C-alpha cells in the first residue's frame, strides 16, 4: 500500500494541485490558451471543452 508516513495527505494534495496547474502551464506554453471552462453539469457541456482532449 501507499505510505501515510512518507508524505502526509496535504503534501499529496499539493502534488495534485501542482499537477493540475503544471498541465495548465504546459498547455498554455503550447497553445497560449486559457484552460478555463464553464463547469455546469446540468446544461450541455460548454463549447471548446470538446477541445479538452489534448489536456
Amino acid at each position: 500500500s501507499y505510505d501515510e508516513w512518507d508524505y502526509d495527505l496535504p503534501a499529496r494534495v499539493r502534488d495534485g494541485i501542482a499537477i493540475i496547474t503544471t498541465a495548465a502551464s504546459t498547455m498554455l506554453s503550447e497553445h497560449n490558451s486559457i484552460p478555463q471552462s464553464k463547469s455546469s453539469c446540468n446544461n450541455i457541456q460548454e463549447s471548446r471543452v470538446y477541445e479538452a482532449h489534448m489536456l
Partner: protein, 55 residues
C-alpha cells in the same frame, strides 16, 4: 513562477454518497466554471472513484 496562478475553493463533506457527492460537485460547478477537481477521503470505499469518474 508557473504562468497560471491557482484560484482555489475548498469544501468538505462528512460521509460519502452518490447523491451527496454528485449534488455537491455540480453545486460547486454552478457558474463558478472550475477547470479541475481533486478528491480525497478518509474512507475505505472502493466505489467512490468510479462515481467521480462518471462525473
Amino acid at each position: 513562477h508557473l504562468p497560471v496562478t491557482p484560484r482555489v475553493e475548498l469544501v468538505t463533506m462528512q460521509e460519502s454518497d452518490p447523491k451527496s457527492i454528485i449534488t455537491r460537485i455540480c453545486d460547486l460547478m454552478s457558474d463558478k466554471k472550475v477547470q479541475g477537481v481533486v478528491f480525497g477521503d478518509d474512507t475505505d470505499q472502493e466505489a467512490i472513484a468510479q462515481i467521480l469518474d462518471f462525473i
